[PDB]
Design a binder for this molecule. Structure first.
Ligand SMILES: NC(=O)c1ccc[n+]([C@@H]2O[C@H](COP(=O)([O-])OP(=O)(O)OC[C@H]3O[C@@H](n4cnc5c(N)ncnc54)[C@H](O)[C@@H]3O)[C@@H](O)[C@H]2O)c1
Ligand SMILES: NC(=O)c1ccc[n+]([C@@H]2O[C@H](COP(=O)([O-])OP(=O)(O)OC[C@H]3O[C@@H](n4cnc5c(N)ncnc54)[C@H](O)[C@@H]3O)[C@@H](O)[C@H]2O)c1
Ligand SMILES: NC(=O)c1ccc[n+]([C@@H]2O[C@H](COP(=O)([O-])OP(=O)(O)OC[C@H]3O[C@@H](n4cnc5c(N)ncnc54)[C@H](O)[C@@H]3O)[C@@H](O)[C@H]2O)c1
Ligand SMILES: NC(=O)c1ccc[n+]([C@@H]2O[C@H](COP(=O)([O-])OP(=O)(O)OC[C@H]3O[C@@H](n4cnc5c(N)ncnc54)[C@H](O)[C@@H]3O)[C@@H](O)[C@H]2O)c1
Ligand SMILES: CC(=O)c1ccccc1
Ligand SMILES: CC(=O)c1ccccc1
Ligand SMILES: CC(=O)c1ccccc1
Ligand SMILES: CC(=O)c1ccccc1
Ligand SMILES: [Mg+2]
Ligand SMILES: [Mg+2]
Lengths: 251, 251, 251, 251
């Protein structure tokens, strides 16, 4: 309770799985929240499932859409006052090796996973700096920002980019006394409805050779590290990677 | 509030600075706490400053003392019930290059910073495994576990050792279903009375070439990441490094 | 002598500085070399400065040009036989923070530094796999693939991407028994004519707070690690980062 | 040929496997070499197998023996002139989890793998600094200096320590203009007679979940990266980790 009092957060891809848990816990801690998704049918229901409009709203947006990011910030500020917190969570995967990645797949993934995080980080800094908000940008950056996977070539590119770009932004913010921190969160495999719909997926990810705990995590595992990073508890953490992966990258 | 309900923690070097803040916040979150220090004059006062004996006690112990670690666990369990949480925080520094480190300095530092963390981790696993406690071992492992410093040669050895030994322990615990997690915390420079007593130290550490935020942190910065790691909030985090350094290692 | 016998290498941006030294040493070790650059006036002279057409040729190409990559491989194979070795060295920098990066700057840098390395890596794997060449792809990936710099936001994104994408490609190649290795090289600051033309640059980069050796490196420093990685000497190295930075990332 | 002309190297544990290959290639490149081992029966034969006394000699020494390190340097200098190159290669393993490591096992491993590297690094700096030798200290620091293994607890401690202590030493040497570089080499699994004598070991290490290349390496794989690091080719590399692991740490 109260760990995010007065905060105003945008969470991209906040309508499902990890994003929805982050929104849920954010609201529970006192934050006002705008969640996004490219699809309105999902977002409208999702917000209501978490709370009332005074707590949480939906804004339809594809994070790859530059001009829409401005509209998104404006809508959030209209609803809740100046934004203090941005979680760049929206992402997609292509299940291809580097060898087998089409250029169209490449461009499509980089638009969401890399351009979208860039657009959101850049705008966030511009909108949140110098306001005494204890502003925090949390970029979702995966175990796949640390290690490769033979069948996630473009994904790996996107996640390594986010990992180090976030450091750049953290440093400039720190050096300029912007009162904006930038950090990355690195989930291992997390159980969601989508993983549940992929036959064999959770079992494959739970083999000790993949996740040493022998099971995968749950959305709240990612929500809790996000609360810490959005809160003023983490006011001396910037430019750092926070990994919650059941041991996946420790071996 | 309540984030550590039912937990029983040992914090080595819990009587001053970072250790004392960790103890303070632990108590505030519902944990029972045993703090240690080689010196009784400090520890007795420190416990009382935080809370009552039903919340927090002192046990005199040098973390380099193998046999005393057993006594410590036994005393904690006597006071509060089975231990769920160990923060290996006690440490010393020698201000020498590798070139200029005496063998006596070398052995003395490794006894506290490395043997002591080993003794505590080993015993913790043995005492906490298979009890359904949501057991967590948090090993203090420094920015100096990631980068070198020309005048911290033995310290760097100790902190790199702790960093990777903790991974080993995390993995074995995960693979064996012990219900024990092991992670490391990596503070940058933190303001304490001891730093305050070193003329010029805080200013030197606050230069942008050292800490990009332009200032050093405070004990509570380390306390809050420890709360997260001791709590069940972090139940899928094991084998990972959590850095709170004001940007120091990001550049 | 003879360390690259029978090898056939493409080096992008091989006409100046690091790329030219890599080409020079490659030729000296027995490799046939095709160097590229967007500008013909530079490339023609550069090749001749190193050796004869039977040793080294120029092919005009912007690494951001997908279709030209095919033409490049075809020309190299025509000149020298099947390609065994690719050094993705061409790159540009934008001297902007994330905050201050225009979208046009962003797209332009990612086209050369990220898309171009992707196009070259993908094609290289397709053309070099399963031929018994001891094939090696060496991706230039910078100190800026490890740490951030406040004024290199897009560059940092590109270099982090290359760093982890290269791991993906290495893994798939290894798992499929392609006889292709993929590794990254991470230069610190290196003295070239371009650095010489930037007043104050070498001095700034040589401050101990930047490069602990107190001076910057020279093109041959990067050439020699490339020889090792192109040669069969490195036949068990794949998926790894090789840093030659005068200590820059060690502190 | 000639890549180590004029160099004078000590290689600890130079009589078998990786150490012997490093000695062999060193001699082949023009270096004079003193190899060590605790056992004389092995060392005497080993030297002769590589070359003549004017090229390579044996000195009986346990790297855990502080006072013997001085004797070792003195003997080398007597034979070949001032030492330019030290490869701290001697090491042992205990096949125990942290939980199950006895204190005697702990102390024994740390004596060889950590104290021994410290003694050798410290003395090397003192003996090699300020002599214009292009001095290089290469510390063997394992894949187990990057990731944990549940059954290599003390080993992991030792290898993480070496990894970061080497950075400290590199930095001090660089900052003081000592003309001594310090770097670490990180082998994955390598085929030797000892591995051959462990039934099932090579097959277990060659599973794609362990080594993605599907096979383990050979002693020369480690020799070649050592040649590069001992040579002046690497004169701008210090404080860095060089990994040759068949992909083991890339996934
Ligand atoms: N589910 C897992 O096991 C897992 C594991 C590792 C990492 N991740 C990563 O963590 C993050 C969060 O995952 P999640 O569970 O909310 O995902 P999910 O798989 O359950 O659903 C995908 C999410 O991304 C959003 N999304 C996709 N494209 C978008 C776009 N153009 N604009 C806005 N939103 C978009 C959706 O709203 C949705 O919340 C992602 O960046 C993903 O790359 C997930
Ligand atoms: N103060 C800083 O700026 C800073 C910065 C980086 C890291 N650290 C590290 O963080 C950890 C915590 O620091 P702190 O502020 O509690 O320290 P402090 O500098 O204020 O005081 C030293 C601490 O270590 C304990 N200690 C020392 N030797 C001991 C032994 N043999 N047995 C038991 N206790 C012992 C003391 O109780 C005390 O709490 C340490 O491991 C240290 O290495 C501190
Ligand atoms: N010079 C330094 O101090 C330094 C330091 C760190 C990293 N780097 C990096 O190392 C690599 C090599 O540098 P260099 O010294 O050959 O560079 P240089 O600065 O001397 O000249 C730039 C190089 O890139 C090439 N180039 C640029 N855009 C290109 C395109 N679209 N297509 C083909 N070629 C292109 C040029 O041929 C030229 O060789 C680059 O990836 C760069 O990002 C350089
Ligand atoms: N063999 C592998 O598969 C493998 C894999 C990863 C790492 N390593 C590591 O690489 C290094 C070299 O291995 P190697 O193949 O020469 O080993 P080896 O297993 O074939 O034989 C052990 C080596 O260590 C030496 N040694 C052990 N204790 C010693 C002491 N107290 N003093 C002096 N010498 C001592 C011996 O001379 C011998 O060369 C070691 O540090 C080891 O920890 C080996
Ligand atoms: C972690 C991850 O990227 C992923 C991607 C595609 C399918 C399943 C998992
Ligand atoms: C962080 C650290 O180790 C230190 C050591 C000695 C003095 C001041 C700081
Ligand atoms: C290393 C590097 O990226 C750089 C970029 C621009 C100018 C000078 C150096
Ligand atoms: C790499 C390694 O440490 C090892 C140790 C013991 C047995 C086999 C391998
Ligand atoms: Mg791994
Ligand atoms: Mg640094």
């Amino acid at each position: 309770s109260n760990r995010l009092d007065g905060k105003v957060a945008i969470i991209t891809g906040g309508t499902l799985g990890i994003g929805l848990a982050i929104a849920t816990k954010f609201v529970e801690e006192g934050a006002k929240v705008m969640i996004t998704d490219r699809h309105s049918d999902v977002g409208e229901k999702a917000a209501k499932s978490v709370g009332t409009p005074d707590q949480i709203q939906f804004f339809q947006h594809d994070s790859s859409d530059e001009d829409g990011w401005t509209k998104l910030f404006d809508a959030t500020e209209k609803a809740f006052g100046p934004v203090s917190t941005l979680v760049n969570n929206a992402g997609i995967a292509v299940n291809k090796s580097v060898e087998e990645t089409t250029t169209a797949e490449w461009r499509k993934l980089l638009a969401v996973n890399l351009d979208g995080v860039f657009f959101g980080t850049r705008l966030g800094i511009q909108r949140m700096k110098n306001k005494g908000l204890g502003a925090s940008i949390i970029n979702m950056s995966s175990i796949e920002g640390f290690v490769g996977d033979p069948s996630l070539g473009a994904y790996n590119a996107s996640k390594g980019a986010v990992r180090i770009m976030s450091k750049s932004a953290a440093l400039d913010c720190a050096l300029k006394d912007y009162d904006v921190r930038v950090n990355t969160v690195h989930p291992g495999y997390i159980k969601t409805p989508l993983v549940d719909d992929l036959p064999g997926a959770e079992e494959a990810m739970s083999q000790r050779t993949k996740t040493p705990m022998g099971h995968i995590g749950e959305p709240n595992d990612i929500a809790y590290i996000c609360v810490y990073l959005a809160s003023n508890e983490s006011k001396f953490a910037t430019g750092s990677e926070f990994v919650v992966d059941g041991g996946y990258t420790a071996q």
